[PDB]
Each structure stands twice: as C-alpha cells, then as structure tokens.
Amino acid sequence: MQNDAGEFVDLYVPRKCSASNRIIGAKDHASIQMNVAEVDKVTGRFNGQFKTYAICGAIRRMGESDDSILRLAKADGIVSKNF
Amino acid sequence: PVARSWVCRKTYVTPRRPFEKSRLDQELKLIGEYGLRNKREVWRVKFTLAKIRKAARELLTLDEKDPRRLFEGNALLRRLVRIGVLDEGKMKLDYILGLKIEDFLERRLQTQVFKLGLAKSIHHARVLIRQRHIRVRKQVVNIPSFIVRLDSQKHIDFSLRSPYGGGRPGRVKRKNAKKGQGGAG
Amino acid sequence: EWMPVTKLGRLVKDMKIKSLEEIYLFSLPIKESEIIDFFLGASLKDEVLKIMPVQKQTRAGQRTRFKAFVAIGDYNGHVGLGVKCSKEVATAIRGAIILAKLSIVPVRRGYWGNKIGKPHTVPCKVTGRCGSVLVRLIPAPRGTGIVSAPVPKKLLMMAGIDDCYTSARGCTATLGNFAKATFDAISKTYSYLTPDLWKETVFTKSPYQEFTDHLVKTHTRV
Amino acid sequence: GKCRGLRTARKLRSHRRDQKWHDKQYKKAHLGTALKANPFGGASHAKGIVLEKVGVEAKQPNSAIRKCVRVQLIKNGKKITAFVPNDGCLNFIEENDEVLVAGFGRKGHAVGDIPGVRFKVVKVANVSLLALYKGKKERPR
RNA sequence: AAUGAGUCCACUUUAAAUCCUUCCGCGAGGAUCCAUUGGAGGGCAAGUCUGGUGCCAGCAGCCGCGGUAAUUCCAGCUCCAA
RNA sequence: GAAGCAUUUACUUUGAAAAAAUUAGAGUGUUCAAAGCAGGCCCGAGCCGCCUGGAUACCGCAGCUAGGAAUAAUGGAAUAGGA
RNA sequence: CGCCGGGCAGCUUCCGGGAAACCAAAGUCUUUGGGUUCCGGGGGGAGUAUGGUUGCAAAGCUGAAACUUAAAGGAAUUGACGG
Numbered sequence: 018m019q020n021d022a023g024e025f026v027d028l029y030v031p032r033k034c035s036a037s038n039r040i041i042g043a044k045d046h047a048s049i050q051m052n053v054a055e056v057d058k059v060t061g062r063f064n065g066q067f068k069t070y071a072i073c074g075a076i077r078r079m080g081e082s083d084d085s086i087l088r089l090a091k092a093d094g095i096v097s098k099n100f
Numbered sequence: 101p102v103a104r105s106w107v108c109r110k111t112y113v114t115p116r117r118p119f120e121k122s123r124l125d126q127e128l129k130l131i132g133e134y135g136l137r138n139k140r141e142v143w144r145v146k147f148t149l150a151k152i153r154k155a156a157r158e159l160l161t162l163d164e165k166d167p168r169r170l171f172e173g174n175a176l177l178r179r180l181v182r183i184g185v186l187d188e189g190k191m192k193l194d195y196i197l198g199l200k201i202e203d204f205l206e207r208r209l210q211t212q213v214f215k216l217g218l219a220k221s222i223h224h225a226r227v228l229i230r231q232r233h234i235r236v237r238k239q240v241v242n243i244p245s246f247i248v249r250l251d252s253q254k255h256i257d258f259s260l261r262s263p264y265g266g267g268r269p270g271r272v273k274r275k276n277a278k279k280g281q282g283g284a285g
Numbered sequence: 286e287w288m289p290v291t292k293l294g295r296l297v298k299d300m301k302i303k304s305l306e307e308i309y310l311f312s313l314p315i316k317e318s319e320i321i322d323f324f325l326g327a328s329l330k331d332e333v334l335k336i337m338p339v340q341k342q343t344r345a346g347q348r349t350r351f352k353a354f355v356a357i358g359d360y361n362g363h364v365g366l367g368v369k370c371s372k373e374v375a376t377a378i379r380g381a382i383i384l385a386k387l388s389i390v391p392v393r394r395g396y397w398g399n400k401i402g403k404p405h406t407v408p409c410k411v412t413g414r415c416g417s418v419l420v421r422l423i424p425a426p427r428g429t430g431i432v433s434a435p436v437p438k439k440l441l442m443m444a445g446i447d448d449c450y451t452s453a454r455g456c457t458a459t460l461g462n463f464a465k466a467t468f469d470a471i472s473k474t475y476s477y478l479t480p481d482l483w484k485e486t487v488f489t490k491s492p493y494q495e496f497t498d499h500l501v502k503t504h505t506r507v
Numbered sequence: 508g509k510c511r512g513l514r515t516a517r518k519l520r521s522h523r524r525d526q527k528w529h530d531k532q533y534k535k536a537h538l539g540t541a542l543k544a545n546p547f548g549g550a551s552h553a554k555g556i557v558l559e560k561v562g563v564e565a566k567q568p569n570s571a572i573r574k575c576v577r578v579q580l581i582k583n584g585k586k587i588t589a590f591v592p593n594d595g596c597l598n599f600i601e602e603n604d605e606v607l608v609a610g611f612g613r614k615g616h617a618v619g620d621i622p623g624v625r626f627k628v629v630k631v632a633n634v635s636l637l638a639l640y641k642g643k644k645e646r647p648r
Numbered sequence: 649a650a651u652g653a654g655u656c657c658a659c660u661u662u663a664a665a666u667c668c669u670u671c672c673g674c675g676a677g678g679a680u681c682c683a684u685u686g687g688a689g690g691g692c693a694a695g696u697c698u699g700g701u702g703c704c705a706g707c708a709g710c711c712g713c714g715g716u717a718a719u720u721c722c723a724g725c726u727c728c729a730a
Numbered sequence: 731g732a733a734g735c736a737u738u739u740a741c742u743u744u745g746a747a748a749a750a751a752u753u754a755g756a757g758u759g760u761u762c763a764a765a766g767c768a769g770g771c772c773c774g775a776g777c778c779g780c781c782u783g784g785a786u787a788c789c790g791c792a793g794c795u796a797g798g799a800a801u802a803a804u805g806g807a808a809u810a811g812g813a
Numbered sequence: 814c815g816c817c818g819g820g821c822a823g824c825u826u827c828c829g830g831g832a833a834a835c836c837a838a839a840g841u842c843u844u845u846g847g848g849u850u851c852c853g854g855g856g857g858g859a860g861u862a863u864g865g866u867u868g869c870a871a872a873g874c875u876g877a878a879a880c881u882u883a884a885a886g887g888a889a890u891u892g893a894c895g896g
C-alpha cells in the first residue's frame with residue numbers, strides 16, 4: 018500500500034485483533050466481532066450506540082477471549098473498573 | 101609466439117527445459133511476427149536484454165549518489181535512449197527493468213524497412229536487405245539484424261545502384277528485354 | 286436459476302453487498318459458489334493440474350476412483366484450489382471446480398523496491414507447508430517473471446503475481462501437496478503483518494447487522 | 508549439533524573432508540581403484556580385436572539372445588564383451604576384425620537386460636557401423 | 649521481376665601472391681542451384697495410420713515394448729524438435 | 731613544530747602499493763556482430779592541417795598507513811618493591 | 814489442608830512440531846546461527862579380506878576393494894488370510 022505517488026494499492030485493509038494485535042485473515046472462521054451496547058448515564062436504557070471488539074481465532078482457542086474482552090471493557094469504561 | 105587475439109564469446113543461451121509448450125508457442129509467435137530465421141535469433145535478443153537487466157539490477161542495489169551508479173546508469177540510459185527502445189521521459193533504471201524483447205526486435209533494420217513502407221510483408225523486407233537494395237545514410241547494408249539508431253532513422257532508403265532507386269535494371273529484365281528485341285525489330 | 290439458502294447468498298443476490306472484499310474483510314465463510322461467480326464472473330479461468338486414478342482394494346478387485354486438481358482464478362489477485370474424488374472423471378472435474386470457487390482467497394502484492402507503479406510481486410517472503418513439501422516465495426524485481434516449477438508457476442500466474450523467485454523442498458512429485466503448499470503461501474500473504482498495516486483498525490458494521498431489516502423481511506422465510 | 512565458533516575452521520574443514528570420503532562418487536573418482544579396474548583406463552573409446560561372436564541371454568522377464576563379441580584390447584590387453592547394436596549388425600563383424608569400442612551409457616554400469624555388458628561396438632574395421640547398417644558404405648573388400 | 653552460389657576480365661590487396669572488398673561479361677521455375685541429424689508410450693514436442701515379425705529378430709539412459717489385431721521392433725506415409 | 735602516547739591487539743573506515751592481458755565497464759556505425767583501439771571535421775584547395783581518444787572499477791589473505799573505539803581479548807596499587 | 818525446591822512418572826491440551834505413529838519435547842527450524850562431543854550418506858559384498866594392535870584363548874578395536882543391484886526400507890490405509 019502507498020506507492021510513492023501516494024495512492025493505495027491494496028484489495029482491502031484486514032482487521033487486527035483487539036487483544037493480540039494480529040491480522041484476522043480472510044479464512045479465519047473462528048474469529049468473532051462483537052458489539053457491546055452502551056447505556057445512558059441516567060436511566061440505563063440502550064441509546065443506540067455500541068463498542069466493537071474483534072478477537073482472532075488463536076486467542077479464542079487459547080481460552081483467553083473472556084479475560085481479553087473483560088480487560089477491553091475495563092479500558093473502555095464499560096461496567097466497573099473495580100469489579 | 102603469435103600476434104592473434106583469441107578473444108570471443110557466445111551471444112545466446114539455450115533454454116533450460118526443451119519442449120515446453122508455452123515457451124515454444126511464444127517464441128514461434130516472435131519468429132513468425134518478426135520474420136526471423138531460427139530460434140537462435142530470439143535467444144540472442146533475449147540474451148542481450150538479460151545482460152542489460154543484470155547491469156541495471158546491480159546498479160539498483162547500489163546506493164544513490166554513488167559515483168559508479170551515476171556514471172554507469174547515465175551511460176546505460178543514454179545508450180538505450182539512442183537506440184530507441186526507451187523514451188526520454190523514462191530516464192530511470194526502473195524503466196530499464198520494464199523492457200521487453202518486442203521493443204528490441206522492433207529496432208532491427210528488417211522491421212524498419214517493412215514499417216517504413218519501403219517493402220511490404222516483413223519476409224520481403226528480409227530478402228530486400230539481403231540482396232543489397234537498402235542503405236542507411238550512405239552505407240549499403242545487407243544485415244537484417246542491424247539495430248537502427250534514432251538519429252540514423254530518417255536516412256533509410258533504397259540504394260543508388262539497385263533497380264528501385266537509380267537505374268541499371270537487373271539481369272532478368274535485361275535478359276528479357278534483349279531477347280525480346282532480338283526476336284523483334 | 287440460483288435460489289440461495291444462506292444470509293450471505295441472500296444479501297449478495299439482492300445487490301446489498303458488492304465487491305467481495307468485505308466478505309473477506311469480515312472473514313465470513315462462503316458456502317455457495319454462486320456468490321463467487323456472481324462477483325468474479327467472466328474473469329475466472331480454470332485449468333486441471335492433474336487427474337490421478339486412486340484405488341482401494343475390495344474382494345472383487347480394486348475400486349478405481351478419480352481425483353481432480355483444479356486451480357481457478359482471475360489474473361488480478363484471487364486464486365482458489367479445489368480437489369474432489371469421484372467414480373468418473375467429469376463429475377470429479379465439476380466438483381473440483383465448485384470446490385475451487387468456494388476456497389478462493391485474496392492475494393497481496395507488493396514491490397521489490399522503488400514502489401513506482403502497480404504492485405507486481407509478493408510483499409515479503411512467505412512459506413507454505415503441506416505434507417513434506419515446503420514452498421518459499423521470494424520477492425523479485427520487475428520483468429523477472431516467475432522462476433518455478435510448472436505447477437507453482439500455474440498457481441502464481443493465476444494469482445496475478447508477475448515476478449517471483451521460488452524455492453521448494455520435499456517430495457514435490459506429490460503434486461497435490463505441492464499445489465497445496467503454494468496455495469498456503471499465497472494465502473498467508475494477507476496473513477502477514479507489515480509496518481504499513483500497523484495503523485489502528487476502525488470497525489465498520491458487519492453485513493449481517495447492516496442489512497438485518499432486509500434479512501428479516503425477505504430471507505426468513507417467505 | 509555442529510560447532511559454530513569463530514575459531515573453528517580447522518574442525519569444520521577436517522570433518523568435511525573425512526566425511527567426504529563417505530559418498531560413492533567422491534571415493535570412486537578419488538581413490539584410483541576404479542581407474543585401475545576399468546579396462547579403458549579413463550579413455551572414452553578403445554580399439555580391440557574380436558576373439559569370437561557370442562550371444563548372451565537377456566535377463567528376465569525379457570527373453571532374447573543379445574548378439575555380442577568378445578574383444579581383446581590393443582593396449583593393456585584385457586578382454587571385454589561388447590554389444591553389437593542393431594537388427595542385423597552382427598553379420599557385418601567377421602572374426603579377427605579390429606573394432607572400436609565405446610561405453611554403453613551408464614559410466615561403467617550394465618544397461619538394460621543385457622547382463623554384465625558395459626560396452627558397445629562402434630566402427631568395426633574402420634568403416635562405421637551406422638554407415639554399414641544404413642548402406643552408406645561397405646566393408647573394405 | 650530480384651538476387652547471390654558459381655564461371656570469370658580487370659583493379660585493389662601483398663615482399664610476391666591468395667582471400668575478402670570493388671566491378672565488366674555469363675549465371676534460377678521441379679528456381680533437380682534438391683538440408684540434414686535425431687525422434688513420434690511416459691518423463692518429453694509429435695500417429696493407437698498401414699504392411700511385416702510373433703517373448704524371435706530387435707528396441708529400451710529409466711519405467712518398460714515384443715508369445716499371429718505391437719501407439720514402442722523392421723519399413724512406408726504423415727507429424728515433432730534443433 | 732622537535733619528542734612521546736596515560737597498555738597491546740583483534741575489528742572497522744581511509745590512504746598508499748597490488749604487471750599487462752583476461753573479467754566488469756566508458757567512448758567509437760568493423761556495412762551489423764564476435765572483434766579492434768581506433769577515429770572525427772573543412773576544403774569554394776594551400777589546409778603548405780585541425781580536433782580528440784587510447785578512461786574507470788575490481789585485484790582474496792599477509793604486510794604498510796591514518797581516523798574511530800562499541801564489541802572481544804589483555805595490562806597497572808595487596809608482604810605496596812604504588813603514583 | 815496448602816506453599817516452595819529438586820526427583821520418578823501420569824492424565825489432558827489446535828503451544829508448536831512431525832511422513833505419520835506420536836512427542837510438552839521429538840517444540841521455540843526457509844521467520845533456517847545458545848555452547849559443544851560423537852556419528853549417517855541407496856541396497857548388498859561386509860563388519861568380510863588384508864595390515865596393525867589388545868588377549869591365555871574365545872575374541873575385541875581399527876577397517877577396504879573388486880564385483881553386484883533398481884530398489885531395499887519407514888509410517889499409515891483398504892482388502893485377503895490367521896492351527
């Protein structure tokens with residue numbers, strides 16, 4: 018990508034895992050992308066927005082997708098920070 | 101003991117695999133479409149291109165602003181431009197790496213004679229050269245593989261002695277005319 | 286006439302998603318070949334690498350089946366390689382073509398150096414393994430062509446890679462393994478991570494939620 | 508594993524030549540027993556004199572009589588057996604003729620179903636065997 | 649219509665010649681002024697065409713071919729490679 | 731600037747010296763090329779001749795030379811016979 | 814009932830590897846370099862002949878070549894057969 022003239026020479030830009038920062042390939046059918054709903058501060062109703070996490074198949078096969086999603090949710094202000 | 105030189109080299113290389121269908125088809129297309137004699141002429145042209153590409157690769161691996169890179173790259177680019185296989189706008193070694201042997205085969209004298217309208221049908225252009233009808237600027241050339249430079253391009257013409265430029269018609273026309281006038285009054 | 290039974294096939298047939306790259310981007314499984322010849326129609330070429338007559342022994346002699354190796358692809362960055370075995374050859378070739386369409390993958394291309402024009406070679410050196418076969422693809426300058434055996438040459442020409450040094454190891458007379466190893470290296474082009482891909486990704490909506498209203502009205506079930 | 512030390516060139520080189528003696532081709536080329544054993548003595552062809560015409564039975568599963576000659580070489584006068592290749596070429600060779608003899612293709616190895624024959628006849632007395640077979644020339648009579 | 653390859657006068661060449669080069673005069677219609685070596689099962693481009701032979705004669709680097717319908721021998725024809 | 735280096739080496743960079751030919755490579759229409767080292771420009775003619783080349787690189791290890799000083803080896807005060 | 818260290822092992826695992834059987838080492842290997850010793854190079858002939866050397870002997874150690882051959886092997890699969 019980015020030949021010297023400046024344009025982008027790529028079919029597409031693949032996703033990176035949000036836990037291990039690895040490329041999620043086009044034939045990785047164990048890799049999820051999950052949106053987590055946000056709520057407003059006053060009444061806790063779903064306000065139409067969400068935060069998105071992608072996990073590659075290797076992390077999700079290690080058994081570490083649970084802790085990774087929990088840490089990402091800590092980092093994004095989802096639920097507790099003191100759980 | 102002797103004042104000889106003995107310095108010589110081959111000008112071609114044979115392909116590694118004989119009887120490859122795709123390669124056979126491609127070089128037959130080149131032979132038929134450019135009117136060559138054998139596979140050896142195709143191999144000679146692609147050997148020439150391969151040596152140019154080897155020089156260009158070795159210069160490209162060197163550092164920019166190296167004096168040797170500047171000197172030999174400029175000389176190589178000037179040479180390829182003066183024989184017309186590379187344009188003046190494309191004056192970098194990458195465009196040297198973009199060349200193909202259909203660019204070199206176009207610069208032969210046979211191809212130029214056919215494409216200048218000076219002879220139809222590239223096979224007729226070969227036999228016209230080999231029978232000494234054609235001259236670059238004033239020199240009579242019978243070499244179908246003469247590589248025509250850009251400067252000596254406007255000066256391809258019939259030679260002054262052939263019966264397509266000046267006079268003196270050939271032995272067949274002279275023979276037919278003299279037997280006709282011997283048979284007539 | 287194509288009547289799809291898949292959410293992805295329903296979205297593809299109704300022109301809701303175009304340009305197969307986002308199907309790759311969200312890494313979804315393609316389970317209908319009609320999607321592939323919908324997007325890459327009139328550019329896919331297929332060729333038979335090998336027909337091998339496999340056999341198993343029964344008490345009334347051998348039962349001979351036929352295995353077909355078909356490589357497919359447009360010459361601009363997609364290949365697949367399918368393999369099917371059948372009692373007769375034409376059925377095996379048909380099934381191998383369908384399987385090759387289903388297993389199609391995008392090919393990343395790069396520059397040898399001085400990134401001037403279109404990308405022409407592999408972006409780095411990649412290696413695929415299958416059985417004992419190890420195939421190594423190496424970036425080559427422009428006009429080099431493909432320096433390979435005929436089988437990875439066929440696969441790499443269908444990938445749209447113009448210039449590639451190669452290297453092999455193992456029993457390469459096991460053409461199935463050797464084709465599969467070339468296909469493996471080709472797919473791990475986009476498996477690979479390069480400094481120009483370090484930029485943080487931005488998550489767009491998956492096609493399953495972008496058109497969930499279309500899918501609830503038209504796909505299920507009516 | 509192998510030693511990788513910066514000052515280990517002697518160990519590496521000595522090991523390599525000691526282990527180079529362990530392949531068949533290097534030992535065959537560099538020992539001199541093979542050069543002494545073969546009748547040509549490193550030459551590509553040799554001249555000899557036919558002692559008798561023999562037929563060797565082909566190895567199984569083939570079944571034929573391969574027409575050979577028994578030849579005694581002029582230098583170092585060993586006795587070899589040479590094939591006479593083509594459909595009728597044995598009738599050209601008469602007893603006590605003087606042939607040229609070449610290798611038979613596999614560098615001192617037997618070829619085909621012919622058991623133990625490493626040589627073929629080229630040019631029975633000086634007219635070549637191919638020209639005799641093709642009718643180009645005839646025996647110098 | 650065009651041309652050499654040859655035959656050959658002269659120049660030139662050279663110590664003297666020869667060869668090339670230059671140039672008179674002759675020199676092509678099966679332009680008989682005649683392209684050959686290897687091959688045609690696979691590896692490996694190219695025939696399951698025909699006649700003969702019948703585990704013989706032979707081919708075949710290697711797998712193999714041949715026991716009276718040989719895609720492989722011996723030939724003709726036709727193709728392939730340089 | 732005369733003298734010396736507060737260790738000595740390895741290493742690295744530079745500079746000298748490594749025959750020519752061969753190889754790489756610049757220039758040059760041998761009629762093209764393999765080659766060669768040659769050539770090119772005006773003559774309306776005195777022109778009682780003018781211009782230009784015959785480059786450059788590479789040449790292991792050992793030896794010589796001048797900068798660097800990380801890495802690796804090594805050395806100085808313990809019976810103080812120390813600065 | 815636990816924790817730490819060093820042991821002999823076991824189960825399980827898409828760590829990764831491997832031709833596979835399998836292996837937490839047989840992993841961290843074409844993305845190939847932590848240190849080092851011994852050792853293989855198609856099958857036979859042959860661990861034979863010969864020389865040397867050790868031993869009371871039996872034998873041990875070191876150790877060819879001529880010649881011969883297109884496979885000999887490994888691991889898995891399907892059948893067939895199994896007193």
Ligand SMILES: [Mg+2]
Nearest residue numbers: 508509847848
């Ligand atoms: Mg180790």
Ligand SMILES: [Mg+2]
Nearest residue numbers: 688695720723
């Ligand atoms: Mg025939």
Ligand SMILES: [Mg+2]
Nearest residue numbers: 529531854855
């Ligand atoms: Mg052995």
